[PDB]
Amino acid sequence: KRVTFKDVGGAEEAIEELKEVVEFLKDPSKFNRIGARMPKGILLVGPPGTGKTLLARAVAGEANVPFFHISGSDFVGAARVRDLFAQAKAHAPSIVFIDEIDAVGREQTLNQLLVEMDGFDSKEGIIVMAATNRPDILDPALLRPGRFDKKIVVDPPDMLGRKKILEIHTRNKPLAEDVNLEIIAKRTPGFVGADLENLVNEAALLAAREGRDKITMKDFEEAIDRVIAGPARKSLLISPAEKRIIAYHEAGHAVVSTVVPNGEPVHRISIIPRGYKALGYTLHLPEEDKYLVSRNELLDKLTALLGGRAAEEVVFGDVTSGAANDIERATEIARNMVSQLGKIDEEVKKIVTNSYERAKEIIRKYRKQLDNIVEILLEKETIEGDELRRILSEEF
Amino acid sequence: KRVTFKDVGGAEEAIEELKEVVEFLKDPSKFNRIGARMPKGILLVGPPGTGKTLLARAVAGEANVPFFHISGSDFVGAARVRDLFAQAKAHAPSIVFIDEIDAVGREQTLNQLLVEMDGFDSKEGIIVMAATNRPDILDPALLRPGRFDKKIVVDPPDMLGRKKILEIHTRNKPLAEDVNLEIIAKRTPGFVGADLENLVNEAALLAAREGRDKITMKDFEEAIDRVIAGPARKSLLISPAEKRIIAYHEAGHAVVSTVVPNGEPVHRISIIPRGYKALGYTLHLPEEDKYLVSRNELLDKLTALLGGRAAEEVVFGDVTSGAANDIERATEIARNMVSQLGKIDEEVKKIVTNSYERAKEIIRKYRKQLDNIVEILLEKETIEGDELRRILSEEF
Numbered sequence: 001k002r003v004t005f006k007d008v009g010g011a012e013e014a015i016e017e018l019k020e021v022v023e024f025l026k027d028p029s030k031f032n033r034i035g036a037r038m039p040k041g042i043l044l045v046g047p048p049g050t051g052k053t054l055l056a057r058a059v060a061g062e063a064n065v066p067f068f069h070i071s072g073s074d075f076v077g078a079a080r081v082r083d084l085f086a087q088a089k090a091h092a093p094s095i096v097f098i099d100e101i102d103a104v105g106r107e108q109t110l111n112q113l114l115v116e117m118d119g120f121d122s123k124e125g126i127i128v129m130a131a132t133n134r135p136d137i138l139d140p141a142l143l144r145p146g147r148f149d150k151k152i153v154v155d156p157p158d159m160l161g162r163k164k165i166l167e168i169h170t171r172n173k174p175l176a177e178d179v180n181l182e183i184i185a186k187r188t189p190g191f192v193g194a195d196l197e198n199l200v201n202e203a204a205l206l207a208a209r210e211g212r213d214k215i216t217m218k219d220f221e222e223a224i225d226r227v228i229a230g231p232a233r234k235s236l237l238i239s240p241a242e243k244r245i246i247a248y249h250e251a252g253h254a255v256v257s258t259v260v261p262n263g264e265p266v267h268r269i270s271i272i273p274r275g276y277k278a279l280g281y282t283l284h285l286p287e288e289d290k291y292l293v294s295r296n297e298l299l300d301k302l303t304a305l306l307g308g309r310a311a312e313e314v315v316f317g318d319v320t321s322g323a324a325n326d327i328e329r330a331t332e333i334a335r336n337m338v339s340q341l342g343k344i345d346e347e348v349k350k351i352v353t354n355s356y357e358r359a360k361e362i363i364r365k366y367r368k369q370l371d372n373i374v375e376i377l378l379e380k381e382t383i384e385g386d387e388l389r390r391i392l393s394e395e396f
Numbered sequence: 397k398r399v400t401f402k403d404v405g406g407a408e409e410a411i412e413e414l415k416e417v418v419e420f421l422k423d424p425s426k427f428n429r430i431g432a433r434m435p436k437g438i439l440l441v442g443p444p445g446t447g448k449t450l451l452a453r454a455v456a457g458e459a460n461v462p463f464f465h466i467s468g469s470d471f472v473g474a475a476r477v478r479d480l481f482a483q484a485k486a487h488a489p490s491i492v493f494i495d496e497i498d499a500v501g502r503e504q505t506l507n508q509l510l511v512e513m514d515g516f517d518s519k520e521g522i523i524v525m526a527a528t529n530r531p532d533i534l535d536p537a538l539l540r541p542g543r544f545d546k547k548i549v550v551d552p553p554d555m556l557g558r559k560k561i562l563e564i565h566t567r568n569k570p571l572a573e574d575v576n577l578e579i580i581a582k583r584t585p586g587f588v589g590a591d592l593e594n595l596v597n598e599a600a601l602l603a604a605r606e607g608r609d610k611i612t613m614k615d616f617e618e619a620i621d622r623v624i625a626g627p628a629r630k631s632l633l634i635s636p637a638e639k640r641i642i643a644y645h646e647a648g649h650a651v652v653s654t655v656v657p658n659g660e661p662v663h664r665i666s667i668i669p670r671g672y673k674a675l676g677y678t679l680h681l682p683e684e685d686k687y688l689v690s691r692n693e694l695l696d697k698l699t700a701l702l703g704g705r706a707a708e709e710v711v712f713g714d715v716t717s718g719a720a721n722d723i724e725r726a727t728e729i730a731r732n733m734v735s736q737l738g739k740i741d742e743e744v745k746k747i748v749t750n751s752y753e754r755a756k757e758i759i760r761k762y763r764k765q766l767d768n769i770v771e772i773l774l775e776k777e778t779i780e781g782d783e784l785r786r787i788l789s790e791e792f
């Protein structure tokens with residue numbers, strides 16, 4: 001089946017980057033006449049079920065061009081790669097898609113792919129795309145310049161994104177007048193596009209088992225309970241008890257960074273992760289992103305990175321998986337500070353311990369402001385620039 | 397012979413799930429007009445003699461449709477599979493049944509089955525069913541989406557279920573006025589539907605050997621002794637001595653989980669296993685079922701899982717087969733906690749040992765409450781929601 005950008009919801013930022021590829025594929029001549037050089041390969045990274053293959057298919061749908069694809073789980077391998085690239089050259093504008101590239105990047109198959117990437121002319125209108133959910137185990141040879149040197153991140157949907165996906169999959173189904181798609185969206189935090197599609201099918205089965213010809217609000221609410229438990233369960237959602245712990249963790253980062261003189265501005269607070277760092281990806285990039293290395297700005301960065309872990313210990317006396325990654329990142333930052341700013345393992349241990357104590361004292365103070373932010377975050381699920389600026393000014 | 401749902405006892409939950417299949421088979425048009433998608437295959441799992449084939453036959457009995465079946469123990473194989481599916485297509489609504497699928501899922505026969513599953517149209521009213529008692533040795537290719545993606549569990553009967561099965565097989569037999577079917581049910585813990593059917597035949601043989609024309613209560617009691625011992629024995633039952641050990645094991649889980657702050661609520665206690673986890677099945681599912689991973693809730697889960705093993709050691713100084721599986725599951729949970737929460741084998745060993753000591757101290761205390769629950773469990777064999785809530789409130 002053919003799909004376009006109208007079948008995708010909650011991927012505005014990813015779709016923005018992919019518009020240039022469609023323009024290049026529709027008319028390569030406009031890029032060549034001014035010496036604009038397009039990348040040879042593009043990589044999509046994200047959690048399973050977020051719609052990476054759907055975006056690749058929609059890109060080919062928007063620009064009416066052929067679509068040659070292969071899957072890395074099916075891996076004779078060297079000969080299959082040769083056939084795919086030969087077919088794409090016979091048709092001037094085309095797309096080559098490689099799904100699950102982590103399962104193949106056995107040594108002979110990878111070598112053939114490297115030879116093919118260097119052997120085709122980009123000015124003919126040929127692009128190569130790939131997708132994976134384990135970007136940190138890829139062979140470093142694939143990420144060198146001239147081969148797969150562009151990355152795009154696909155994120156889980158938020159409240160507004162979930163409601164848009166539900167409308168897409170119910171546009172050809174009869175619904176009653178008591179169905180409220182916004183209430184259903186508010187009750188499925190943590191779901192992805194694949195879980196929402198399966199939920200709609202379960203609600204239709206409950207109505208057909210009784211011979212009715214319309215889906216009611218009661219069918220949707222009973223479907224949620226059936227997909228999260230039992231011998232055949234498909235989805236996981238965030239319970240009210242787990243939501244309080246997550247709200248305190250996120251609010252701890254914002255409070256500490258707003259107090260330290262060298263802290264960075266805060267633009268958004270949410271219950272759902274958005275950034276690639278928030279998803280646990282390093283992307284083969286250095287941790288340091290500043291031209292100058294100074295002691296004062298490095299200590300403030302360490303203290304703000306431990307704010308989420310300090311809030312859990314002071315309010316609950318617990319520790320989660322997210323707080324364990326924060327302490328691991330801080331330990332490697334303190335290791336580079338000793339060698340650049342002037343027995344070694346004992347010095348690194350002292351730097352981390354001092355910063356942790358500093359963050360805890362800041363949490364004990366201002367404890368009234370931390371509680372106020374959590375209450376608002378538990379009823380809206382997200383606060384962003386303009387509304388967040390006013391809130392942060394009333395407090396502090 | 398034709399059978400319906402009136403010939404099945406003690407399978408209410410399984411029968412509830414199968415009602416939708418009958419409705420689909422009776423009129424597929426009502427499902428297609430609202431875009432409801434039915435599964436292609438259904439799998440039945442349970443211990444031998446629990447009535448998996450009887451349910452498959454009753455499903456075809458309830459909805460007057462053909463019934464094409466084959467057995468996996470009889471396995472030319474590829475040609476036999478082709479014939480079965482071709483026959484089912486010539487008749488619009490039909491059922492395809494594959495018994496003992498574990499004996500066939502040699503490589504050519506399995507490949508043909510995969511091709512057939514993808515080649516038929518579900519909207520015509522065709523469903524495929526299978527059964528097995530070794531679900532953990534099936535080929536992973538059979539459980540992928542679009543082929544055998546729904547599972548139903550069949551459980552051994554309880555006291556009330558055993559009495560219903562006895563009435564079904566004595567409805568065409570002359571009985572005396574001193575026969576009490578409820579007393580017979582109380583004296584056969586551990587029997588399945590196949591054992592109860594054979595018991596009724598033995599009682600009739602004892603009456604015919606004396607020329608009588610009615611079965612008495614004495615015939616039933618002598619039949620029990622004949623089927624559990626001798627050169628030709630058929631059944632196994634739980635003796636009074638083995639019942640005390642099992643009662644203490646089950647009560648240990650409930651006492652520990654009621655004390656830990658993060659423990660889960662207890663809804664039912666019984667001598668007969670009910671869940672798929674209690675039957676020793678993993679079903680190819682991940683052990684973790686929570687969105688958030690925290691240290692406090694993981695330690696409480698480990699302690700409550702070792703409560704049954706702690707009660708056996710403190711009261712009897714023994715260990716059973718069930719307690720050996722609990723320690724194996726706990727070891728794999730502690731292995732994922734080290735990698736996610738921050739020489740490795742030595743750390744895993746310490747986590748399990750600390751939790752075991754915690755459970756034993758809880759058992760030593762509250763030992764008076766543990767004894768009280770065992771006495772009630774030895775005279776009713778099962779306690780459930782409303783009656784259990786009151787009992788747990790009087791204690792503790």
Ligand SMILES: Nc1ncnc2c1ncn2[C@@H]1O[C@H](COP(=O)(O)OP(=O)(O)OP(=O)(O)O)[C@@H](O)[C@H]1O
Nearest residue numbers: 007008009048049050051052053054165193194197
């Ligand atoms: N944003 C979305 N809008 C609408 N449907 C979506 C969206 N994201 C996912 N889906 C649904 O998810 C289904 C499966 O998604 P897709 O095949 O793209 O998975 P994926 O992200 O590649 O997963 P994996 O990592 O497991 O391969 C698609 O059929 C589509 O119906």
Ligand SMILES: Nc1ncnc2c1ncn2[C@@H]1O[C@H](COP(=O)(O)OP(=O)(O)OP(=O)(O)O)[C@@H](O)[C@H]1O
Nearest residue numbers: 403404405444445446447448449450561589590593
């Ligand atoms: N719930 C029940 N009610 C009545 N009879 C039952 C029940 N369960 C089993 N039986 C009796 O058990 C006999 C054998 O059961 P069945 O053929 O369904 O075995 P099964 O569960 O498929 O066993 P296996 O795993 O050994 O193949 C049936 O003839 C039926 O008389």
Ligand SMILES: [Mg+2]
Nearest residue numbers: 052053099131
């Ligand atoms: Mg995919």
Ligand SMILES: [Mg+2]
Nearest residue numbers: 448449495527
């Ligand atoms: Mg059988």
Ligand SMILES: [Zn+2]
Nearest residue numbers: 308322323326
């Ligand atoms: Zn954090």
Ligand SMILES: [Zn+2]
Nearest residue numbers: 704718719722
């Ligand atoms: Zn146990």
